[PDB]
Each structure stands twice: as C-alpha cells, then as structure tokens.
Amino acid sequence: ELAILKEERTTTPYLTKYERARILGTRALQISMNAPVLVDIEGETDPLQIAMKELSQRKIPLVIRRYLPDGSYEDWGCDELIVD
C-alpha cells in the first residue's frame, strides 16, 4: 500500500556513503557471529575486509529500504546499486 513499484523508483542508483558504511558494518557483524561466507577466504581474517570483498563482487544479501519523507519507501538490492 506504500511500497513504490520497481519501475517507478526515482531515487539515485548509486550507493551512498552512509549506506555503504551501514552495509559493511552489518555484514561484518554477521560474519563475526558465524554466518556463512559468500566469497572464498584466501588469507584474510578481519570481518570488515571480508565484507568489503563481498561488496566489491556485489555479493551482499541485503536490501536497502529508502524511506521517502511522506512515509513511502523504495526497496533497492545491494546487487543493483552502483558502487564506485
């Protein structure tokens, strides 16, 4: 009743720095508490490094809900958001 249609999405298609920071933090927390890792681990042990590696390959299983001022929201997958 409040979700915006995917073709009607009007927000920016790029990943903002706040969104990037929150995604990295949440993924690092999840990996730290023994969640399955979507990308192979070569020699790294730091959860934040693994989260950044997952983000670079668009392997983040998270969805951003950008809230419009009125109350409506847009759902954006981390795979479909452009990362600089």
Partner 1 sequence: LGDVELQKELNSEYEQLVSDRKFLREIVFVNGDHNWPLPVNLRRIIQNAQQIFHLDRAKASDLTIPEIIHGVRDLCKKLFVLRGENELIKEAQQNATSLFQCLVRARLATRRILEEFRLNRDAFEWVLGTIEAQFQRSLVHPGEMV
Partner 2 sequence: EDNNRIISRLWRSFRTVKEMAADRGYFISQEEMDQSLEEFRSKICDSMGNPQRKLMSFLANPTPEALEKYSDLGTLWVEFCDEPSVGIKTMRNFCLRIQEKNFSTGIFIYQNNITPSANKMIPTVSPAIIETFQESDLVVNITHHELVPKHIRLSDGEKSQLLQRYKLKESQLPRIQREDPVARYLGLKRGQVVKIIRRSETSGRYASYRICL
Partner 3 sequence: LIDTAVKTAETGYIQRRLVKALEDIMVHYDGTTRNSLGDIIQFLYGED
| Site residues (CB under 8 A) for partner 3, limited to 8-37 | 10-12
Give me the 14-33 binding string for partner 1, x by CB under 8 A, dash otherwise.
x-xxx---------------
Residue by residue, DSSP assigns 17-54 as HHHHHHHHHHHHHHHHTTPPPSS--SS---HHHHHHHH
Tell me if 45 contacts partner 1 by CB under 8 A: no
CA–CA separation, 74 vs 8, rounded Å? 9
Query: Token pair of 79, please?
Result: 């795979």
Footprint of partner 1 (CB under 8 A): 10-12, 14, 16-18, 66, 84
Footprint of partner 3 (CB under 8 A): 10-12, 66-69, 74
